[PDB]
Amino acid sequence: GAINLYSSRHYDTDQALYDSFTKKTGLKVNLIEGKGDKLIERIKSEGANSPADVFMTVDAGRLWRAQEAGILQPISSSTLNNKIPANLRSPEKLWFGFSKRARVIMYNKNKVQPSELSTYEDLAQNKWKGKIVIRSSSNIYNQSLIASLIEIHGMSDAEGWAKGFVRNFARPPEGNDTAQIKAVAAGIGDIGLANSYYLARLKRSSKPEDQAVADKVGMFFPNQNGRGTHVNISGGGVVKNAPNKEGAIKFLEYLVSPEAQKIFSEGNNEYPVVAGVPIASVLKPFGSFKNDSTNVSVYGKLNADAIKLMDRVGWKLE
Ligand SMILES: N[C@H](CCC(=O)O)C(=O)O
Ligand SMILES: [Fe+3]
């Protein structure tokens, strides 16, 4: 009568989702939390004795690592496949996206007009020297973005890009995504890269100071006239030895319902994955944007190459 959810992605507001699921299915949700890579290690080590039914985390790169650890089993569901865009789920049906984030250009509104922005590729141009802030190469979001660039350009051309990008750093990578947004607002950089939901989070904060930062920083969705913006996922899958496989599948299917999509996405100011679900009020002012159709599993497949490239060009680790 229960499922065991091992998640790094729980927010307090998600209790509404678990309670609705229980009303609809009869199944309790037992929550086990941890950091994503630690949960993968925990499930792998628990092995055939693991009680885990569902694993959830952020970033297709981490979901790929879970898949490679052998802790997931494939699921074939008409509901999951029809409702989740193909680009946002594993080609092998091992994991699935349930909310979406974009890795965007954050820009100082005083110093940068959006007409000056275009693509990720343009960020390697000399005009940005001394102007870019971004976090360390240890961060999965950055690894996944670089992986996408290696997929497009190949290692040689991507290395040339990365050499110019790193040359443009205003300071050594320092702090998290929110720290980059604050540095852009403060004039330490004119532009930075961060996930969309971090600006939204500031635009909603209980702290007035957070609203002041948010008002100074715009969000630009790159590559609109070409392949589209780099998107990534919060997602999950059914665990290999799930004691309640049937219940685990019911939970994933419930997550694509319109009501669950709203609660889950809005809990972290992310976009829904399901077509037709209304967008959070905080995200509407930024407008819709073209998403790249690349399958997000590529981000994991080329994660090791991204790490190698980052080291080669001297993009500092945390
Ligand atoms: N950075 C948070 C944490 C969740 C995670 O790191 O798994 C998020 O984007 O939801
Ligand atoms: Fe995050």
Residue spans of the domains in the chain: they are: 1-101+233-279, 102-232+280-318
CA 304 to chain CA centroid, Å, is: 18
19, two tokens: 């309670």
CA 156 to chain CA centroid, Å, is: 26
Give yes or no for residue 57 CB within 6 A of ligand 1.
yes
Method of elucidation: X-ray
The verdict on whether residue 198 carries a ligand-binding annotation is yes
Alpha helices in the chain (DSSP H): 15-25, 36-46, 60-68, 78-83, 140-167, 177-186, 196-204, 208-216, 245-255, 258-266, 297-301, 303-312
Give yes or no for residue 58 CB within 6 A of ligand 1.
yes
Give yes or no for residue 9 CB within 6 A of ligand 1.
yes
CATH classification code of 102-232+280-318:
3.40.190.10
The answer as to CATH 3.40.190.10 being correct for domain 1-101+233-279 is yes
The verdict on whether residue 6 carries a ligand-binding annotation is no
Distance CA 103, CA 121 (A): 14
Topology match between the domains 1-101+233-279 and 102-232+280-318:
yes
Q: Which residues contact 298 (CB under 8 A, 6 or more apart)?
A: 147, 148, 151
Count of beta carbons in the 10 Å neighbourhood of residue 165: 22
Distance CA 308, CA 303 (A): 9
Four-residue CA torsion sign, 268, 226, 134, 202:
negative
52, two tokens: 């885990």
Largest CA distance in the chain: 60
Four-residue CA torsion sign, 240, 67, 318, 105:
negative
The verdict on whether residue 197 carries a ligand-binding annotation is yes
Query: What distance, in Å, lies between the first and last C-alpha atoms of the chain?
Result: 43
CA–centroid distance, residue 31 to ligand 1 (Å):
16
